[PDB]
């Protein structure tokens, strides 16, 4: 179920989205933990704070 | 399981956190959808974008 937010990300869904760093560590991050939207995660590269 | 993030919020957990607006609409929001941490949600008031 969606919440009152205009852009509800449905944290209640049965799927967890991930994104991998391109900066060099090559590690996997939960998208919500690093504050990226599925759009961001797919349309551009991702550089974690340790590789930044 | 935790991801590579230093502060993993475990979106994989079996619980969903919510926060209610104090601005007037009195509506409920999923905390991740509005970008608030459990700490923020508990230690101060919450005013949604529509009530801001």
């Amino acid at each position: 179920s969606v919440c009152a937010a205009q852009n509800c990300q449905r944290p209640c869904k049965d799927k967890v989205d991930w994104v991998q760093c391109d900066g060099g560590c090559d590690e996997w991050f939960h998208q919500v933990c690093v504050g990226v939207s599925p759009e961001m995660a797919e349309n551009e590269d991702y550089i974690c704070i340790n590789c930044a | 399981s935790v991801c590579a993030a230093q502060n993993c919020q475990r979106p994989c957990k079996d619980k969903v956190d919510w926060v209610q607006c104090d601005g007037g609409c009195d509506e409920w929001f999923h905390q991740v959808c509005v970008g608030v941490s459990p700490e923020m949600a508990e230690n101060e008031d919450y005013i949604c974008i529509n009530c801001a």
Binding site: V16, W18, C21 | -
Partner: peptide, 8 residues
């Protein structure tokens, strides 16, 4: 970036 989805 490289992405993936897992369960729940």
């Amino acid at each position: 970036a490289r992405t993936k989805q897992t369960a729940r």
